[model samples]
Target: ANQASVVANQLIPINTALSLVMMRSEVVTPVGIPAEDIPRLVSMQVNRAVPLGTTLMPDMVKGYAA
Candidate 1:
């Protein structure tokens, strides 16, 4: 499911405090992540903010989740 999306029109610092909303970002790849699982994953953004167009890699948030 390539139901991927990026920061609608602007944002992503990817910093430690980089909190990701279901509305920011724009990158990653064929291994796209869907929103259906956004529940727990959304909050997993505890790692940081990504930039618009930047792919949201699974590990980017996955690695930080732990």
Candidate 2:
């Protein structure tokens, strides 16, 4: 299935710079990112630290930066 998982109300670390951390798909929640969107997000990179538990928003990510 085309789905992804996120941290469960916890701080998930970014082990990679250009890739995203995926967990498992779950029920649609308030702060969780949609499973179908995972593909697009996987290619994006975060500029700074992210509060994994928070809702995944555009502000949380940026174009690939050095």
Candidate 3:
């Protein structure tokens, strides 16, 4: 679950809860982030404008909705 989800801009939408997003997950990097570290932050809303299929990471999220 450490793998990163690289998605296009305006795919995930801003202010949305990540918990709502489906598990389009994979292990691209064995140690990318802690298990569920991204999901666990469900409380934190998305800051992007992704449509729905665009995968994401905290850094590039700006391109989406920042």
Candidate 4:
């Protein structure tokens, strides 16, 4: 699994709208988060395309049906 683990390119802002700056400075830094955290920073977006979730559903149904 280590050979295929994920590594985020940008630090995600996990805070509210009003605390955007504070969140970015604190959360998106320290070799952990991105210095320039973009908008729409959701967990689902920064995740790997694994075969066990909503993404898997379509493939599963399609392949099984076929």
RMSD of each: 4.6, 6.0, 6.4, 13.7
| TM value for model 2 | 0.44
**Candidate 4 residue runs with Cα over 4 Å from true position:** 1-22, 26-30, 42-66
Tens digit per residue, CA lDDT, model 2, 1-66 = 434434324453554343444433455444445645655666665555656455454455565222
The lowest-lDDT stretch of 10 consecutive residues in candidate 1 is 1-10
Misplaced by over 4 Å in model 1 are 1-10, 15-29, 46-49, 62-66
| CA-lDDT, candidates in order | 0.45, 0.49, 0.45, 0.25
Clash count per candidate:
12, 2, 10, 1
* Model 4 residue pairs with clashes: 11-34
> Per-residue lDDT of 1-66 in model 1, one digit per residue for the tens?
335543323344453333345444334455444433444454454245665555555556644432
Winning model by lDDT: 2
Q: Give the poorly placed runs of model 3, Cα more than 4 Å off.
A: 1-11, 27-35, 60-66
Ranking by lDDT: 2, 1, 3, 4
In model 3, residue pairs whose N, Cα or C atoms come closer than 3 Å (at least 3 residues apart or on different chains), thus clashing, are: 5-56, 7-55, 10-49, 10-50, 10-51, 11-50, 11-51, 11-52, 12-50, 13-50
Model 2: residues >4 Å from true position, as ranges?
1-20, 23-34, 64-66
lDDT of 2: 0.49
TM-score of each: 0.44, 0.44, 0.42, 0.20
